[PDB]
From Swiss-Prot:
The gene is ALB. The modification Phosphoserine is found at S4, S57, S64, S272, S418, S488. GO terms for biological process: cellular response to calcium ion starvation; cellular response to starvation; negative regulation of mitochondrial depolarization. It comes from Homo sapiens. The record marks 3, 19, 40, 63, 72, 92, 105, 135, 158, 173, 180, 189, 194, 204, 211, 239, 261, 273, 285, 358, 371, 388, 401, 413, 431, 435, 465, 474, 499, 518, 523, 537, 540, 556, 559, 563, 573 as: Not glycated. The modification N6-succinyllysine is found at K204, K435, K518, K563. Zn(2+) binds at H66, H246, D248. PROSITE patterns: ALBUMIN_1, ALBUMIN_2. Glycans are attached at residues 11, 50, 136, 161, 198, 224, 232, 275, 280, 312, 316-317, 322, 350, 377, 412, 438, 443, 493, 524, 533, 535, 544, 572. This is Albumin. Ca(2+) 2 binds at D12, D254, D258.
Length: 583
């Protein structure tokens, strides 16, 4: 270490890990360079590291990895005739140089769009050359998602490897592999969204706010930890996320490790759930810790009434350090309720703060704040209720028919939203319902928050680049804790004038009967949205008349001898019979 940084990295990571991350880091700076140029780089940088491992005292093995990596970047021939002013970065000395590079990372690289080949082609390529097949895609994905934390992209890639291993040698390859690839896309996109949103919220609402979130989240997970310990961890976590949000891989990676090193050295004073994690190699340590089970909460804890309502010096302890008092509230409440969403805890916190502001200025303070815990009852109520009604609805309808209810619901509220956006969000919102409703009671709200936070921002980002309704603009710019209830408060837009008829949008062709089940579902769900937008004032019964008449139709023509003639003449009368009903 420090004698040869590059030799130390290599030893800690291993050759295989080393060459994987470097390909990632190279594909994340030079997004336009072809695969094989990157290969040649990764090969040159690894063989070099080897010499340093064998002989740390060698030629320039004492340089920082920041210098080595930069030197390699400015090797690339058409740096100027391809990446433009990025070549100018090479004239700058190292501290400034890397910053110049980060500033030229493109989230909109304007690359094409990865097509997923046939399972046959995939499994053949995978077998006939794993190395090239896998690293080509690692490269192809990393270049499209720069800023995506490199070691995280690596963990997904390893999960792609097992999937391709188990399934290519299966009876029905396609039926084993396709659902996994889809799950992996969804988790990976959800990963990058959660990273994106954390930096955005930090940039928008501030450090103190992030800290409030932190205390909440941490006390839930490490309830046996003392407040002084949770408080330091909150401070430490804020530092690593702040720095990790600057965008540089080595700064982030080293901060994450130190924090993993600390925690693991103090598990006794943190959680009894950190044993297997703290055994893992450096690459996996913080990744493991970040997803650790909740430690069980201390046997028998007193009510919060004593320290927060009854005590003789509430208003005093509050008056000294307000944020400290408010965080202790958070601490004591979060550790007791791992079944609460973090934002909900922040609302009870917000409410406790307000009443304290009013009530501590009273001639007899305890009088006016003695009932404050009675306002928490309806704030806790609202989320708890919403999962019951939604999970019930789902449990008796199944995922696909459950998304179709959301489809109609949200098209009726915000019909100005583009059709594919409505299909994408309503389908997504159904999956978090299929994910979290399978968890038991006390895990539902924390889970629903986790994926709602993703799907909600996803939609906000579209609407930011393309706004079409102000009540959505308002729900997206409202506070952190107000975001979701704002959306739940969306009402049916009955001032929306019906979209005009277009026989194309309701013309169905015989290709549907062969299309993949996912592919096929989008088609129908696209038409459903369009059915609502054309006739939003129709009843549940009117709607279900048409959705049934259509099911019959497709059943008939998809088993006909001449399927294309059937889809033409029968869809011709299907549309007419239906216009007539909703006329
Ligand atoms: C401290 O100031 C800086 C902030 C940043 C950005 C950044 C900036 C943002 C923001 C979000 C982000 C986010 O970008 C990424 O965007 C991608 C958008 O498409 C999805 C698919 O994938 C996203 C990445 O996964 C996400 O991680 C940050 C995470 O890693 C960074 O460093 C990113 O929302 C508000 O403004 C860079 C800097 O370098 C000069 C800074 O100095
Ligand atoms: C610039 C190319 C070489 C990059 C080598 C460093 C790659 C990440 C180091 C892994 C540290 C992981 C720390 C953690 O997340 O817990
Ligand atoms: C969107 C389809 C339903 C998904 C499952 C039900 C979600 C109910 C809302 C949960 C809200 C938790 C976040 C919060 O308390 O602010
Ligand atoms: C604003 C665009 C309309 C399409 C999606 C609407 C999303 C509403 C989010 C509601 C999340 C909680 C579900 C619920 O409150 O029942
Ligand atoms: C205006 C004429 C429309 C006639 C056809 C409307 C069909 C709307 C989509 C039907 C979706 C059915 C859902 C399903 O069966 O999976």
């Amino acid at each position: 270490a420090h004698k040869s940084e590059v030799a130390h990295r290599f030893k800690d990571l291993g050759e295989e890990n080393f060459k994987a991350l470097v390909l990632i880091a190279f594909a994340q700076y030079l997004q336009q360079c072809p695969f094989e140029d990157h290969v040649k780089l990764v090969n040159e940088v690894t063989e070099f590291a080897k010499t340093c491992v064998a002989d740390e005292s060698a030629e320039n093995c004492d340089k920082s990895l920041h210098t080595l990596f930069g030197d390699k970047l400015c090797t690339v021939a058409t740096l100027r005739e391809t990446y433009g002013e990025m070549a100018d970065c090479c004239a700058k000395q190292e501290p400034e140089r890397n910053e110049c590079f980060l500033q030229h990372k493109d989230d909109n690289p304007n690359l094409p769009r990865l097509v997923r080949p046939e399972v046959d082609v995939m499994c053949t390529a995978f077998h006939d050359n794993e190395e090239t097949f896998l690293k080509k895609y690692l490269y192809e994905i990393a270049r499209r998602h720069p800023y995506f934390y490199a070691p995280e992209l690596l963990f997904f890639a390893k999960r792609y490897k097992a999937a391709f291993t188990e399934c290519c040698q299966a009876a029905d390859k396609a039926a084993c592999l396709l659902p996994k690839l889809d799950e992996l896309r969804d988790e990976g996109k959800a990963s990058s969204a959660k990273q994106r949103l954390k930096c955005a919220s930090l940039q928008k609402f501030g450090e103190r706010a992030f800290k409030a979130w932190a205390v909440a989240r941490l006390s839930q997970r490490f309830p046996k930890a003392e407040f002084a310990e949770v408080s330091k961890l909150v401070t430490d976590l804020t530092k690593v996320h702040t720095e990790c949000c600057h965008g540089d891989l080595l700064e982030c990676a080293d901060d994450r490790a130190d924090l993993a090193k600390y925690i693991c050295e103090n598990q006794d004073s943190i959680s009894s759930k950190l044993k297997e994690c703290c055994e893992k190699p450096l690459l996996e340590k913080s990744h493991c810790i970040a997803e650790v089970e909740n430690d069980e909460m201390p046997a028998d804890l007193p009510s919060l009434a004593a320290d927060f309502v009854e005590s003789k010096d509430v208003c005093k302890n509050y008056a000294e350090a307000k944020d400290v008092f408010l965080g202790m509230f958070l601490y004591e409440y979060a550790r007791r309720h791992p079944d609460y969403s973090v934002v909900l805890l922040l609302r009870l916190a917000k409410t406790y703060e307000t009443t304290l502001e009013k009530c501590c200025a009273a001639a007899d303070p305890h009088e006016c704040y003695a009932k404050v815990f009675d306002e928490f009852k309806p704030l806790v109520e609202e989320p708890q209720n919403l999962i019951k009604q939604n999970c019930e609805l789902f449990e008796q309808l199944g995922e696909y028919k459950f998304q179709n209810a959301l489809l109609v619901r949200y098209t009726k509220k915000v019909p100005q939203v583009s059709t594919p956006t409505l299909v994408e969000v309503s389908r997504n919102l159904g999956k978090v319902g299929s994910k979290c409703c399978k968890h038991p009671e006390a895990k539902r709200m924390p889970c629903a928050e986790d994926y709602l936070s993703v799907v909600l921002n996803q939609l906000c980002v579209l609407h930011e680049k393309t706004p079409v309704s102000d009540r959505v603009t308002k729900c997206c710019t409202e506070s952190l804790v107000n975001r979701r209830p704002c959306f739940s408060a969306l009402e049916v837009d009955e001032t929306y004038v019906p979209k005009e008829f277009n026989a194309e949008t309701f013309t169905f062709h015989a290709d549907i009967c062969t299309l993949s089940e996912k592919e096929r579902q989008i088609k129908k769900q696209t038409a459903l949205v369009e059915l609502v937008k054309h006739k939003p004032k129709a009843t549940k019964e009117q709607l279900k008349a048409v959705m049934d008449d259509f099911a019959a139709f497709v059943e008939k023509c998809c088993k006909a001898d001449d399927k294309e003639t059937c889809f033409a003449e029968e869809g011709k009368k299907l549309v007419a019979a239906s216009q007539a009903a909703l006329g």
